[PDB]
Amino acid sequence: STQSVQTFGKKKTATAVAHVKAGKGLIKINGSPITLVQPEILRFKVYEPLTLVGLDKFQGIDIRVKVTGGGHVSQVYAIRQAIAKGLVAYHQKYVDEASKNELKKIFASYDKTLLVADSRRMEPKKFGGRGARARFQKSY
Amino acid sequence: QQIHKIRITLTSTKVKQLENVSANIIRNAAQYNIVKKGPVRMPTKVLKITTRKTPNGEGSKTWDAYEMRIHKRVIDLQAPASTVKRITQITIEPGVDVEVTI
Amino acid sequence: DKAQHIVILDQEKYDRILKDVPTYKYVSVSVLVDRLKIGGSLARVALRQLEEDGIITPVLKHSKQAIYTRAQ
Amino acid sequence: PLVVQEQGSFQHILRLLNTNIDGRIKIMYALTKIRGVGRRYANLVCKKADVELTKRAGELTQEELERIVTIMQNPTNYKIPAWFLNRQKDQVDGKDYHVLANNLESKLRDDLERLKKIRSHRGIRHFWGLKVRGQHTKTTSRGR
Amino acid sequence: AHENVWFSHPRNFGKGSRQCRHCSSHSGLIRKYGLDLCRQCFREKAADIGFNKYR
Amino acid sequence: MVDATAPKKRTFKQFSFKGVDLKDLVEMPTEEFTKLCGARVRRRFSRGLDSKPMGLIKKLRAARAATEPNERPAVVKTHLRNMIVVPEMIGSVVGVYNGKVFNTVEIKPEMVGHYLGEFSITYTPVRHG
Amino acid sequence: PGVSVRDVPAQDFINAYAQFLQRQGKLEVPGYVDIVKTSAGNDLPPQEAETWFYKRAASIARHIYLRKQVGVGALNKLYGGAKNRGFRPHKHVDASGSINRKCVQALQKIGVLEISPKGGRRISENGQRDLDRIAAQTLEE
RNA sequence: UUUCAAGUCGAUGGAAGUUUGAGGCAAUAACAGGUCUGUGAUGCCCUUAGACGUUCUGGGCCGCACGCGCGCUACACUGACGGAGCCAGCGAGUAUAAGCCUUGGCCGAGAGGUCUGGGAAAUCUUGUGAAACUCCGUCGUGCUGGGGAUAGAGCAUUGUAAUUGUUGCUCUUCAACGAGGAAUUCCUAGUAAGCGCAAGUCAUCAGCUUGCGUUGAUUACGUCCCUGCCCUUUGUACACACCG
Ligand SMILES: [Mg+2]
Ligand SMILES: [Mg+2]
Ligand SMILES: [Mg+2]
Ligand SMILES: [Mg+2]
Ligand SMILES: [Mg+2]
Ligand SMILES: [Mg+2]
Ligand SMILES: [Mg+2]
Ligand SMILES: [Mg+2]
Ligand SMILES: [Mg+2]
Ligand SMILES: [Mg+2]
Ligand SMILES: [Mg+2]
Ligand SMILES: [Mg+2]
Ligand SMILES: [Mg+2]
Ligand SMILES: [Mg+2]
Ligand SMILES: [Mg+2]
Ligand SMILES: [Mg+2]
Ligand SMILES: [Mg+2]
Ligand SMILES: [Mg+2]
Ligand SMILES: [Mg+2]
Ligand SMILES: [Mg+2]
Ligand SMILES: [Mg+2]
Ligand SMILES: [Mg+2]
Ligand SMILES: [Mg+2]
Ligand SMILES: [Mg+2]
Ligand SMILES: [Mg+2]
Ligand SMILES: [Mg+2]
Ligand SMILES: [Mg+2]
Ligand SMILES: [Mg+2]
Ligand SMILES: [Mg+2]
Ligand SMILES: [Zn+2]
């Protein structure tokens, strides 16, 4: 077949699988254009990986991502990571590594979570309280 | 009743004997020119039971959390039905039970 | 219990509105209520029409907040 | 759908079923002041009477006002469901009714002696002013 | 006569409908996975049954 | 308000339960009668009547067939206080327990459709001070 | 290039499809739409008395376009919400069955959906054709 | 920086640099701590046929002038509703039963009912399309559309049996509460706080626990000032050890 690389981004439970193929610059979210990511207030979180490098980078590639697990906000951070990880992995494999060693520089200098998944997970709850650290009110 | 796509389901509490029987069958399915699919790691099932420590009702509210793990693996074989059963008796293990369904 | 804001629009307040809203740096639902003594619901229909009539320019559109300014 | 003006047509205080309301309240929520009329009931009589739910009480004409009080007193005649009514399967005549302001407490009362006359458990605790539906009273209901 | 009255009350779908495997108890029963054991009897048999504390 | 009046009348008065006056009420069969009362009562008769409720009515029926100068029909005592009062047993007197004693009750017509134990309180009322 | 339902925002597509179904007038509307509340967890009927049924049928159609064999029981859960038990905590409660079942039953006879094999209700051969049409007349402004 | 030692604080790299995060296990002795109401674990005392055994019926453990403790709704506009958008994880599930999880279809405003089918289960319920949340509207500082007790009438479910309303649904009624004195509790990162979901109990009933995930912070990263405990020194006429 043609030049295809497949990657994934993660937040808490949300996992976004990005497929980056060679093409005209197709960027879809679960079969929907990125111009209509509901969060809105957060539409610029996924617009950040675009405007930092320049839209000229996406002319030759088309990207179709899917996202499952997590919540409404947790899925947005997973999506923006899958696109950013997909762009770097395509350059490493189908473009010179000199170019790959540039995009990763701008992304990391702006936000580590564009490329690196956050390791925070929810702490387990312990008995004797309603939460992980919280405890039942004590009386004397 | 000759060649047969046959599924073998393996369940046990302990993984060492489960993988030995699983590996021994795969090994015996290698020297014998048979086609096989597996082993397939099914999502392990965590049987959890949370009781109170106190047999009576006094003290700090402390709880036990007991656990049990069930690991289930299925292997698909393409061999006659007579051949698969004798493989099962070769790789019989007291802990692991085997069920075979056509 | 002292608010007693007006909910029915007469003629004296109406043209007073069109004479007063333009001389505001910033108009909103609360600005209309605060200074014109009109109710909140009456303010909302006024904003959607005054904008349709061109007197008012929409800075921002939102359900819970309507940010408007003068059009001159 | 735009600001409108009126002169002399608004009526600040209304009197419906011998109850005084406020003309500057929205019509759907003004009628809830009438005892026996909740928000759910007021939404339908205004919609059955073709009184759009965007008018203040004083905006209404008498023709609309008379058309509403007619419907409330005869709900079943206006395709109002039986299950939607206040007093359905009446004790004495077995028909579905919706009692209103100057009738609710009379028939609520008539229900109270009807419980007290037979000396039922629910009627007795009603006499004492205690909860009748089984609520614990050891630690609750401590006011006066 | 008496046989129709003695132990006549239904003793199904209730807490008295079931009991511990080991200590014939009615309180603190564990029904998960069909154990049917009192919670006290479970602790003294958990290692034997195959339940261990890990976390 | 528009207009209000205040008249009243009485078609020979007579006590009535859900549109049916005492004359037809008493000799209606309880299968037909239950069709015009509450949801809890209607469910109970469809669920099947065990021997205890049907047996009590027969004794109550017989107890009236004891007095034919038309005075009170003497008391039948019972534990089944989950009994639903039916028009057939109006005017009969039954003794309904409360755990300790036999409360004596007279079946007035307005008691119909209620549970038999609801008029014999099982606890003596609290009295502080 | 072509236009699909997935290429247009959901919220303003339904406002356009609701308008079409009302002006078209062909949808059979049950007689209780002016009386009933959408869910037992709701406490009031919808505020858009004349148009709430059209918009809800429009919402059901759009949701089914993107999926496969959604039942009517699943539709009650989707539009259901948290009930306000007075002093007890909130809980999710399903929506009314009759309201959802009439819309999907009414829409199948208007030509947009049909009963799918292995349960649910698929979108029709013509169901894809006419929804994708509405999307195009939405985004011209 | 430091006794240049043990270490500590910063950067860089890293998925992870607070013992990487959280738990499970956990020493020498001790308490008259709590349980014989978990045991067909027990010694002794009591009772043992008019039983204190056991069983049936009914009631009670809920009973209400009051004080106290664990909690849930709220006192609103960073909000209520009304539509629309629509994302998790931890888990459970049956047979001649004694009936499990229940989709899909069809009735019903609902609650719920009915007919089929799937699943002893990564297969089906289930992507458990959950709720907070987001968008657009109505409301407009009002004991108001906040709040939903109390109560009347009616409709379903479970169960032999719902009366002292099991629970659910519909209409109506619409109370205190306008952010709470002296006091006092919990807490340092996916933590606190909201927000729901599942499992246990369970024929029915979760404002309870045990967990799980969604949204997601302020403020320390210090000290012995209060409080508790440990160590060192000290006094002692206590050693059943100050309950001396
Ligand atoms: Mg939803
Ligand atoms: Mg919703
Ligand atoms: Mg609420
Ligand atoms: Mg460790
Ligand atoms: Mg001791
Ligand atoms: Mg002791
Ligand atoms: Mg006990
Ligand atoms: Mg005895
Ligand atoms: Mg005894
Ligand atoms: Mg009791
Ligand atoms: Mg108790
Ligand atoms: Mg009581
Ligand atoms: Mg506690
Ligand atoms: Mg609270
Ligand atoms: Mg609440
Ligand atoms: Mg809402
Ligand atoms: Mg699943
Ligand atoms: Mg909301
Ligand atoms: Mg109010
Ligand atoms: Mg409210
Ligand atoms: Mg209420
Ligand atoms: Mg304050
Ligand atoms: Mg403190
Ligand atoms: Mg403290
Ligand atoms: Mg109970
Ligand atoms: Mg539960
Ligand atoms: Mg408990
Ligand atoms: Mg100190
Ligand atoms: Mg010494
Ligand atoms: Zn036991």
* Residue B5 burial by Cβ neighbours in a 10 Å radius (0-12, 13-18, 19+): exposed
Tokens of G107: 């829409």
CB D75 within 8 A of CB D36: no
Q: How was this structure determined?
A: X-ray
Q: In 3D, which of D39, D84, D85, D44 has the Cα closest to residue D68?
A: D44
DSSP state of G137: T
Interface of G with A in 5-44 (CB under 8 A): 6-10
Smallest CA-to-CA distance from B83 within B39, B12, B17, B25 is with B25
Q: Is A54 left (phi over 0), alpha (psi -120 to 50) or beta?
A: left
How many C-beta atoms lie closer than 10 Å to residue G104's C-beta?
21
CA distance A105 to A88: 11
The closest alpha carbon to G6, from G93, G141, G128, G140, belongs to G128
Q: In whole angstroms, what separates CA F96 from the centre of its chain? A: 13
Resolution given for this structure, in angstroms: 3.3
Closest CA to E29 of E42, E21, E16, E38: E38
Asked if D40's CB is within 8 angstroms of G44's CB, the reply is: yes
Q: How far apart, in whole angstroms, are the C-alpha atoms of residue D138 and residue B34? A: 77
| Whole-angstrom distance, CA of residue B58 vs CA of residue A31 | 58
Q: Of C66, C12, C54, which is closest to residue C36 (Cα–Cα)? A: C12
- Asked if F1's CB is within 8 angstroms of D17's CB, the reply is yes
D17 CB neighbours in chain F (<8 A) are 1, 4
> Could you tell me if G53 and G33 are in contact, meaning their C-beta atoms sit under 8 angstroms apart?
yes
Q: How far apart are CA C21 and CA C7, in angstroms?
A: 17
My answer on whether omega of the bond before G117 falls inside 30° of 0, hence cis, is no
- Protein residue closest to H140, using CA and C1': C40
Determine the Cα–Cα distance for residues B66 and A124; give it in Å rounded to an integer: 16
Spatial distance from the CA of E51 to the C1' of H209 (Å): 22
Q: CA A24 to CA E13: how far, in whole Å?
A: 67
DSSP G76: H
Q: How many CB atoms lie within 10 A of CB F82?
A: 11
Cα-to-centroid distance, D122 and ligand 17 (Å)? 49
Say yes or no for a CB contact (<8 Å) between F18 and D120: no
B28: tokens are 């015996």
Distance, CA G10 to ligand 30 centroid (Å)? 58
Angle at A91 between CA A86 and CA A92, to 5 degrees: 100
Measured distance CA(E47)–CA(E38) in Å, rounded = 15
DSSP bridge partners of A28: A33, A64
CB contact (8 A) between residue F121 and residue D69: no
Question: Cα of A130 to ligand 14 centre, how many Å?
Answer: 14
The rounded Å distance from CA B54 to ligand 4 centre is 26
User: Closest Cα of chain A to G141: distance in Å?
Assistant: 16
Taking the Cβ of residue A124 and every Cβ of chain B, the question of whether any pair is shorter than 8 Å is answered with no
Per CB-CB distance under 8 Å, the chain C contacts of D28 are none
Nearest C-alpha neighbor of F75 from the set F59, F87, F51: F59
In window 26-45 of D, residues with CB < 7 A from nucleic chain H are 26, 28-29, 32, 34-42
Cβ contact F86:F114 at 8 Å: no
Which residues are CB-neighbours of A32 under 8 A, at least 6 positions away?
Answer: G6, G7
Q: Is E28 left (phi over 0), alpha (psi -120 to 50) or beta?
A: left
D44 and G34 within 8 Å at the Cβ level: the answer is yes
Q: How far apart are the first and last CA of chain F?
A: 51
Indicate yes or no: CB of A33 within 8 angstroms of CB of G7: yes
- Characterize the bridge pairing of strands B63-80 and B3-12: antiparallel
D-chain residues near C8 (CB < 8 A): 6, 10, 24, 56, 58-59
Residues 26-85 of A with CB under 8 A from G: 31-33, 36
Q: Compare all CA atoms of chain D with the CA of C15 and give the residue at the minimum distance.
A: D5
From chain G, the residues in CB contact with A32 under 8 A are: 6-7
- Is D118 within 8 Å of F121 when comparing Cβ atoms? no
Q: Which ligand is nearest to the CA of F123?
A: 12
Assigned token pair, G13:
């597509």
* CB F45 under 7 Å to nucleic chain H: no
Query: Roughly how many angstroms between the first and final C-alpha of chain C, as a whole number?
Result: 38
For residue D59, give the chain C residue with the closest CA: C8
**Are the beta carbons of A127 and B60 separated by less than 8 Å?**
no
C36 Cβ contact list (under 8 Å, min separation 6): C13, C16, C17, C20, C43
Q: How many CB atoms lie within 10 A of CB E36?
A: 15
Instruction: Note whether G touches D: 3 CB pairs or more under 8 A.
Output: yes
Q: What is the DSSP secondary-structure string of B32-83?
A: TT-EEEEEEEPPPEEEEEEEES-SSS-SS--EEEEEEEEEEEEEEEEEEHHH
Which DSSP helix (H) or strand (E) runs through A9? strand A4-10
Do the Cβ atoms of B15 and B86 come closer than 8 Å? Answer: no
Chain G environment of D81 (Cβ under 8 Å): 32, 35
Q: Which nucleotide in the DNA or RNA is closest to residue C63, CA to C1'?
A: H136
Q: Is the CB of G31 under 7 A from strand H?
A: no
- Residue ranges near ligand 30 (ion) with Cβ within 5 Å: E 20, 23, 25, 38, 41
Residue D140 vs residues A72, D20, D144, F65, F89: alpha-carbon distances, Å: 42, 36, 12, 50, 40
Dist. CA E34 → ligand 7 center (Å): 23
Separation of E18 CA and H54 C1' (Å): 18
Range list of H helices, G66-124? 72-79, 97-108
Provide φ and ψ at B4, rounded to 5°: -160, 125
Alpha helices per DSSP H over F20-127: 22-27, 30-33, 39-46, 51-64
* Count of CB atoms situated within 10 Å of the CB of D139: 6
CA distances from B3 to B34, B80, B83, B84 (A): 10, 4, 9, 10
What are residue B50's DSSP bridge partners?
B65
Q: Which residues of A90-102 are buried (b: 16+ CB within 10 A; e: fewer)?
A: bbeeeeeeeebee
Which positions in strand H are less than 7 Å from the protein's CB atoms? 13, 15-17, 21-25, 33-35, 38-41, 55-60, 62-74, 78-94, 98-99, 103-113, 122, 126-127, 129-145, 147-166, 168-174, 184-193, 195-197, 199-203, 206-216
Q: How far is the CA of E32 from the centre of ligand 7 (A)?
A: 22
Number of neighbours of residue A16 by Cβ within 10 angstroms: 28
Contact of E33 with E50, CB cutoff 8 Å = no
Report d(CA C47, CA C29) in Å as an integer. 8
Q: Straight-line distance from CA F98 to C1' H50, in Å?
A: 24
> Are the C-beta atoms of residues C45 and C12 closer than 8 Å to each other?
no
Which of B48, B45, B98 is closest to B74 using CA atoms? B98
Token pair listed for E17: 């409908």
D102/F20 touch (CB, cutoff 8 Å), yes or no: no
The angle, 0 to 180 degrees and rounded to 10, between the axes of the packed helices C11-20 and C29-36 is 120
From the list C66, C7, C64, the residue with the least C-alpha distance to C37 is C7
Rounded Cα distance, G24 and C42, in Å: 34
Closest partner CB to C8 (pick from D1, D2, D6) = D6
Q: Please count the other Cβ atoms lying within 10 Å of the Cβ belonging to residue E16.
A: 10
Q: How many CA atoms lie within 13 Å of C71's alpha carbon, on the beta-carbon side?
A: 12
Q: List CB contacts (< 8 A) between E46 and chain B.
A: 64, 66
Annotated binding site of E for Zn(2+): 20, 23, 38, 41
In angstroms, the CA F89 to CA F73 distance is: 11
Q: Do D3 and C10 touch (CB under 8 A)?
A: no
3-state secondary structure A29-49: ECCEEHHHCCCCCCHHHHHHH
Overall residue count recorded for chain B in this entry: 102
Q: 3-state DSSP call for residue B8?
A: strand
- Please name the residue that has the structure tokens 């106190």: B54
Residues of G within 8 A of A36 (CB-CB) are: 7-10
